[PDB]
Structures are given as C-alpha cells and as structure tokens.
C-alpha cells in the first residue's frame, strides 16, 4: 500500500496521473460542503484559471528578481492592492508570504528587533487569549515572552486587563478581526488607544477576516467600528489571500503602516561567500506560480466579485446565527458578525453535538477553554446551499441530546473534554508529538 522507495524505473506521465487519482479519490470529503473552513471556494472554473495562472509561472522564483521581473511586478501589485483595501495610503507597504503564520511571524520578528534596538532584552507580546496559535510559535521561535490577556463575556479582549499587562518590555499589542475560535471582532480603536498612549506597535490579525471585512460596507453590512490603517496606532495587518481572497493555498500578506517597521523584518547577510544575500521574508526560494495564481484571483473577482462573495457569505452566516440563537439547549458565543459561529451549552457537554454532527457527515472545529464547537462559512457553503441541512442536523442532534442531558460523552468528544481538565499539560503535549509522528507513518 505505501511507496517506501524510489521505483527502479520511472512511471509514465499517464501512469503517474492514474495513481494520483486514487490518492485524490480519498480527499473528496470537502466537495459536499461538510467541512468547516478548509476550502474557501473550490469552484471548478475558478480552479482551472488558477492552475493555468500557476502553470504560466511554474519555474519562476522571486529569489531571482533579475531573471523574473514579471513576477516581481505581480508581487509589488498584490501588496499595493491590499494596502489600498486596508486604506493604507502612500506610506503603507507590505510583503507577500506563504500564509497567515508567516505574516504573523514576520510582524513579531520586526517588533522584536525594534524592541532590541530600544534596549529591551526579552521583548513581550501582549495578546488576547483568543489570538492565533502562531503568536505562540513566534514567542517560541524568536525568544519573546507571550502574555495572553483574558476575554470579556462577549469573547472580546478585556481592554482593562490588556492595559494592566503592558510593561517596559512590551514589544507589541495584538487584536483580531476576527479571532478564529468565536469569530468575534476585537475592539481595534480601544486597543489602538493603548498602542498610541504607551507608544507600542499594534498588529491587527485579519488573516481570517481580511477579504470579508474590507468589503462589509460595500456589501451593505457596515461594521460598527473602524478596523484598518485609518485607526491611528495600527502599525501592521496580516490578511490571508488563500482564505476569503479565494487565492491558492500558500499565499498571504503582512502589511505595515510605514517602511520603518517593515525594515526590521528583513534579513541581510552582507558577508556571505555565496554573495551579498538579502531576503524580505522567511524563505529563500519561493513558488512564483502561487503569486501568479493569487494575482489572477484578485483580478478575476475584482471589487464586484468580492462584494458579491461577501454578501453571499454574510447572508448565510446571519441566517444561521439567528436560527442557532433559537434552539433550546445551545447558545452562540458573543456576537459573531462574520463567517464564524461558535456554539456552547450550559445544559449538556457541547462535544456530544460535534460527535453527532460527525456521525451525520460534518466536520466542525472542536474548541476549548471554554468547551465549544464552531463552523466557518466559506463561498463553497454559500454556493452549495449547505445551511439548510446544517440547521436540520444541529436541531436533530440537539433534540436527541436533550432526551438524556446527563448521559456520558463518548468517542473523540470525550478526548477533547478530558484534554482541558488534565492537570498535566505535558501529557497533552506528548500525545500531540505522537499525533505528529503518526502523520509520517508508512507502516
């Protein structure tokens, strides 16, 4: 069953593609629209365009701008288009990255280097509890301390608690538009007031929300507060084109209010024997085809395509939100204004609902601290009209659970519940490593 060595004799192109169809046939699940997030559009004609766009630039590598000046122009444009969407102005700038993690790591690294220059020995990240796991990856990789501040009952960062966490060591403040767990937008203007007063950079994580939030007003769903470069104090924004931009996986952006901030993310080796070496991001060689396909997605959708995609997603999310808020036995966490809806229960163990949804063919995210489950609506969910079945299955599952509310939680839901209660955090860390080792298994 497993290929464990290079074949003695190479397979023909047709034989290779025949074998790959057997692998791709096991990766079909998402097509019915039963997976939370994961695939943002997945539309046939869009995929054909993005694959052709990638193919046209397959061998292009932005490590060589002299060999590929066309790709260099494509990337400069993706960044400028994004700065304009976030109302940056002429001083704003940015970089194309491989994903939201890289966009976050680059900002954290820039802010650490700026803090070092100021005499801070151990720079600190002050972020809400809800901030992406990538902020912990940044702390661990870059040797920064991470302070995670508690949330309000509405799943927003408690701004009084954030103010109390700021110190002489604080290198950056964080907030999310929205945070992934509950799909709640953090109070950007209130956090930016702290950023301005204490003269600390502020990173806005719009990896998830980016290509929705920017089109909210034009779609007829304006947000109550500003969230972008128009907010004084916001120094950087991360936004995922691979999400609501409908671009291929492997594409994201890190945007800065000024070049002075971006300079600290750059890597330079002036003395290398292999020549003067300069790189703007983590990678050296990069897949230029991915940037070409990202540019193709932006150009193909345009302002009208994105406003329309946003209208469709928001109509679906608001419909589900109002319906999920009228089901006895469950409640929705905070006030989600975007594509993500998180659920809880004070009457039963919520993981019993995700257990029943799994049995009905759905893949919902199992959250923790507090026990919760979520579903993230994409353009695929809007197109396939999955909301009706999602609602019927939730209602059925909740009805079944409400017959025996004190009954034992079984399967995977029991594991996620136990993992939160476990006093030894090292056992959970050990089982995560075992899970990661299992992914590379050829046994």
- 344-373: which residues touch ligand 30J (CB under 6 A)? 365
Interface with ligand 30J, residue 64, by CB under 6 A: yes
What is the closest distance, in whole angstroms, from the C-beta atom of residue 431 to ligand 30J in the complex?
4
The CA distance from 237 to 202, in Å, is 9
Residue 421 binding: pick among ligand 30J, its own copies, none (C-beta 5-8 Å cut-off by kind): none
In the bound state with its own copies, the residue whose beta carbon lies nearer, of 302 and 405, is 302
* 419 belongs to the binding site for ligand 30J (CB under 6 A): yes
Per CB under 8 A, the segment of 19-27, 161-169, 219-227, 399-407 that binds its own copies is 19-27
**Of the residues 91, 217, 269, 325, which one makes contact with its own copies according to CB under 8 A:** 269
Q: Which is nearer to ligand 30J, 10 or 274 (CB)?
A: 274
Q: Is 143 in the site for its own copies (CB under 8 A)?
A: yes
Residue whose pair of structure tokens reads 């193709």 in the numeric block: 296
By a kind-dependent CB cut-off of 5 to 8 A, residue 289 interacts, out of ligand 30J, its own copies, none, with its own copies
Q: Report if residue 415 touches ligand 30J, rule: CB under 6 A.
A: yes
User: Does 423 help bind its own copies (rule: CB under 8 A)?
Assistant: no
- Residue 15 or 407 with smaller CB distance to its own copies: 15
- For residues 161-180, which are near its own copies according to CB under 8 A? 179-180
Containing H/E element for 332?
Answer: strand 331-332
Which positions from 392 through 411 interact with its own copies, judged by CB under 8 A?
none
Residue 254 DSSP SS3 = strand
Least distance in angstroms from the C-beta of 193 to ligand 30J? 31
Q: Which of 233, 287, 334, 413 binds its own copies (CB under 8 A)?
A: 287
List, in sequence order, every residue forming a beta bridge with 170; answer none if it has no partner: 124
With contacts defined by CB under 8 A, name the span among 31-39, 163-171, 224-232, 344-352 that binds its own copies.
31-39
Contacts of 1 (CB under 8 A, 6+ apart): none
CB of 270 to ligand 30J, least distance (A): 7
H or E stretch including 25?
none
361 binds, among its own copies, ligand 30J, none (CB under 5 to 8 A by kind): none
What is the C-alpha separation between 243 and 224, in angstroms, rounded? Answer: 23
CA 49 – CA 305 distance, rounded (Å):
15
What is the rounded radius of gyration, in angstroms, for the C-alpha atoms of the chain?
Answer: 23
Whole-number Å distance between alpha carbons of 158 and 155: 9
Query: In angstroms, rounded to a whole number, what is the distance separating the alpha carbons of residues 42 and 51?
Result: 12
278 φ, ψ (degrees, to nearest 5): -135, 135
For its own copies, the binding residues in 363-392 under the rule CB under 8 A are 363, 365-369
Residues whose CB falls within 8 Å of the CB of residue 333, separated by 6 or more in sequence, listed in order: 155, 181, 182, 184, 342, 343, 344, 372
Q: Does 4 bind its own copies (CB under 8 A)?
A: yes
Mask: binding to its own copies, 41-80, rule CB under 8 A, as x and -?
-x--x-xxxxxxxxxxxxxxx--xxxxxxxxxxxxxx-xx
Tokens of 64: 């060589």
Site string for ligand 30J, 112-141 (x = CB under 6 A): ------------------------------
Q: Are strands 93-97 and 124-128 parallel, antiparallel or unpaired?
A: unpaired
Of 203-262, which residues contact its own copies (CB under 8 A)? Answer: 242, 248-250, 259, 262
CA dist 403 → 40, 79, 326, 391 (Å): 36, 54, 18, 19
Our finding on whether 326 is near its own copies (CB under 8 A) is: no
Long-range CB contacts for residues 226-229, cutoff 8 Å, separation at least 24 = 226/188, 226/189, 227/177, 227/185, 227/188, 228/86, 228/87, 228/88, 228/204, 229/83, 229/86, 229/87, 229/88, 229/89, 229/92, 229/255, 229/257
- Strands 234-239 and 252-256, bridge-based pairing: antiparallel
CB of 352 to its own copies, least distance (A): 17
Residue 263 binds to its own copies (criterion: CB under 8 A): yes
Check binding of 283 to ligand 30J (CB under 6 A): no
Q: Does 353 participate in binding its own copies (rule CB under 8 A)?
A: no
Instruction: Tell me which residues touch ligand 30J (CB under 6 A).
Output: 63-66, 274-278, 365, 415, 419, 422, 428, 431-432, 435
């Amino acid at each position: 069953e497993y290929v464990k060595a290079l074949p003695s004799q190479g397979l023909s192109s047709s034989a290779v593609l025949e074998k790959l169809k057997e692998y791709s046939s096991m990766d079909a699940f998402w097509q019915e629209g039963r997976a939370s997030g994961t695939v943002y559009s997945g539309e046939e004609k869009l995929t054909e365009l993005l694959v052709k766009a990638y193919g046209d630039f397959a061998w292009s590598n932005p490590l060589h701008p002299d060999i590929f000046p066309g790709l260099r122009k494509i990337e400069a444009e993706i960044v400028r288009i994004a700065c304009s969407l976030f109302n940056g102005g002429p001083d704003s700038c940015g970089c194309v990255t491989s994903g939201g993690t890289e966009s976050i790591l680059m900002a954290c690294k820039a802010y650490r280097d700026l803090a070092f220059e100021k005499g801070i020995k151990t720079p600190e990240i002050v972020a809400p509890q809800s901030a992406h796991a990538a902020f912990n990856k940044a702390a661990s990789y870059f040797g920064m301390k991470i302070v995670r501040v508690p949330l309000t009952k509405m799943m927003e960062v408690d701004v009084r608690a954030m103010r109390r966490a700021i110190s002489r060591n604080t290198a950056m403040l964080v907030c999310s538009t929205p945070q992934f767990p509950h799909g709640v937008i953090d109070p950007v203007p209130e956090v930016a007031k702290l950023a301005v007063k204490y003269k600390i950079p502020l990173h806005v994580d719009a990896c998830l929300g980016g290509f929705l939030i920017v089109f909210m007003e034009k779609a007829g769903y304006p947000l109550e507060h500003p969230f972008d470069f128009r907010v004084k104090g916001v120094t950087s924004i991360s936004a995922d084109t691979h999400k609501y931009g409908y671009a291929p996986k492997g594409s994201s952006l890190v945007l800065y209010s000024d070049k002075k901030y971006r300079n600290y993310q750059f890597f330079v080796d002036t003395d290398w024997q292999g020549g003067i070496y300069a790189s703007p991001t983590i990678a050296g060689s990069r897949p230029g085809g991915i940037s070409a396909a990202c540019w193709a997605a932006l150009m193909h959708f345009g302002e009208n395509g994105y406003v329309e995609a946003t209208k469709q997603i928001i109509k679906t999310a608001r419909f589900l939100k109002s319906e999920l808020e009228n089901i006895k036995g469950i409640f929705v966490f905070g006030n989600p204004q975007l594509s993500v809806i998180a659920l809880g229960s004070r009457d039963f163990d919520i993981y019993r609902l995700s257990n029943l949804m799994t049995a009905k063919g759905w893949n919902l995210n199992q959250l923790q601290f507090p026990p919760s489950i979520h579903f993230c609506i994409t353009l695929l969910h809007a197109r396939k009209r999955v909301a009706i079945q999602f609602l019927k299955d939730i209602r059925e599952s909740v009805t079944q659970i409400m017959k025996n509310p004190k009954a034992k939680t079984t399967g995977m839901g029991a594991i996620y519940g136990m993992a939160q209660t476990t006093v030894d955090r090292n056992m959970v860390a050990e089982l995560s490593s075992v899970f990661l080792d299992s992914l590379y298994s050829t046994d």
